Amino acid sequence: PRRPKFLAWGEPVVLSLLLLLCLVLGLALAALGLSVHHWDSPLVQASGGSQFCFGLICLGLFCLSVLLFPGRPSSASCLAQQPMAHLPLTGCLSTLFLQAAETFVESELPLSWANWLCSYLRGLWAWLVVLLATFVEAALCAWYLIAFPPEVVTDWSVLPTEVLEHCHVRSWVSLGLVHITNAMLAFLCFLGTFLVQSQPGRYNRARGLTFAMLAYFITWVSFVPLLANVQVAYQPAVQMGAILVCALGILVTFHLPKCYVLLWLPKLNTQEFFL
Amino acid sequence: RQLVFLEWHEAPTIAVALLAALGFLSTLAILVIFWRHFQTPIVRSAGGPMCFLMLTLLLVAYMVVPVYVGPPKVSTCLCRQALFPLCFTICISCIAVRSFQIVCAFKMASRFPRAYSYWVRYQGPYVSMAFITVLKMVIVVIGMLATGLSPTTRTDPDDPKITIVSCNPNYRNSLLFNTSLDLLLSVVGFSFAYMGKELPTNYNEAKFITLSMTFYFTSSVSLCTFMSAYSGVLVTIVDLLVTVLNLLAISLGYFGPKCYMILFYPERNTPAYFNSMI
């Protein structure tokens, strides 16, 4: 007789990803701790102050979202899987988009427009931009959960002696409805930074932003063919891996080197070098 | 069963046609703005008549859509397979050559003149463009006349009542062997242009080459991923959308800044100013 099949808590494919989750979340919260301890210093203020902390928190939630994929499916899990990941991801990426906006405006624009426009990339209006991005993401997710909601599917035939239960996406083309906003924010962030030229004797945000978006796009380009090719039993594993590796790609590339400067090289944390 | 091919009633078909119309009209505007200012530094530094050749090729390439749409014939097979893609590759080759010239020439002259003078003399630039041109042309001819000049059809994978009509058998493989040479050219031009990001030599066009090659690279990778993960009816219009987006990525992404400066920074078109950039 047939037995059900799904990613089990304790299967090595799940444990090896939970350890990765532990590493990524620990790094994110350690970076937040260093940020809180050095809250007032130039390296934090030049990162938008509380914007830095909020981005790290959004990344932490983005990482914690993976706990919905493995285990016995349920309708709530099926509907929650994608939004619970990509909404915090928008909340994170919008802050990097603001950093890219600053670094672009202050390097590739006439000085009058630079000194005018820069005022609206700080304070209340920066939170306005973040809130707008989050609202658009939520609206497209509300569209997704009505036009293309996934379902718990029991598939008796695709395995030789087992029953597959999986959160069936109706079609991959429908899954872009939740990706598009984050992807466009990432692409704009990349274009805003990847061609900047560094002034001598000062910090260079553009390289960090550029490499972070490059890792993002590498991850999500690799994600598609893996999802297409992998055995039907392990697509949740691919989705979890993509989420965690994307979070790691951002974390190791943008926040972590600032933490390293705080720890090893505090002599650089000066008004002249960062501001 | 029922045959399927692009037609003017469809929402995505008319959307792509409108996008192509925008591209064609903008390219024509570029060409005429150039023609009036034919005697001035911004266009003379662009190589003059070569840019009009390139813009004519782009104008012709934008004419693809009315030939791409509708029930195919052998002539439309030739058009879809060879005639327009070759027009695209010709342009990309010239962009790559200019990217090489801008950044590498002075260094090579200072460091390897005894070898580089072989490229300086004879007709080095035209030689490179012609070599790449015939390479792409012969590859295209081999593929097309091997796979056939008649239309091809397949059964839809999830609504088998409809059969899909196209001109490129084994679509993913055909696109791979079509676009590999263009990817090589893209990477080479991007490398040289990025190494040239600081240089003003010809109104900073290394920066715009970098931008346009980025717009081409992302679209090419997106198309390859999509074809690696989808097989339904949409393929034969996603390919067209990507083609039009590439033609835009060139027509706007490389020429637009030049005409923008012609219109709104005419002071920089003065020879006394150009002498500070040359």
Author numbering:
A (entry chain B): 561 to 835
B (entry chain A): 554 to 831
From the article:
Sugars and other sweet-tasting compounds are detected by the sweet taste receptor, a member of the class C GPCR family. The sweet receptor is a heterodimer composed of TAS1R2 and TAS1R3,3,4 two type 1 taste receptor family members that share the distinctive architecture of class C GPCRs: a large extracellular Venus flytrap (VFT) domain, responsible for ligand recognition; a cysteine-rich domain (CRD); and a seven-transmembrane (7TM) domain that mediates G protein coupling. To address this gap, here we present cryo-electron microscopy (cryo-EM) structures of the sweet receptor in the inactive, unliganded state, as well as in the activated, sucralose- and advantame-bound states. Unlike other class C GPCRs, such as mGluR, CaSR and GABAB receptors, where agonists stabilize inter-subunit VFT interactions to promote activation, the sweet receptor is activated by the rearrangement of a TAS1R2 VFT loop, which destabilizes interactions between the lower VFT lobes and the VFT–CRD interfaces.
We first determined the structure of the human/mouse sweet receptor in the absence of sweeteners. To improve the resolution, we combined all particles to generate a global reconstruction at 3.1 Å resolution, then performed local refinement focused on the VFT/CRD region or the 7TM domain, obtaining final resolutions of 2.9 Å and 3.6 Å, respectively. While the orientation between extracellular and transmembrane domains can vary, each domain remains nearly identical across individual classes. In our apo sweet receptor structure, the two subunits pack closely against each other at both the upper and lower lobes of the VFT domains, as well as at the 7TM domains. In the apo state, the 7TM domains of TAS1R2 and TAS1R3 interact through two interfaces, a configuration that is markedly different from that seen in other apo-state class C GPCRs.
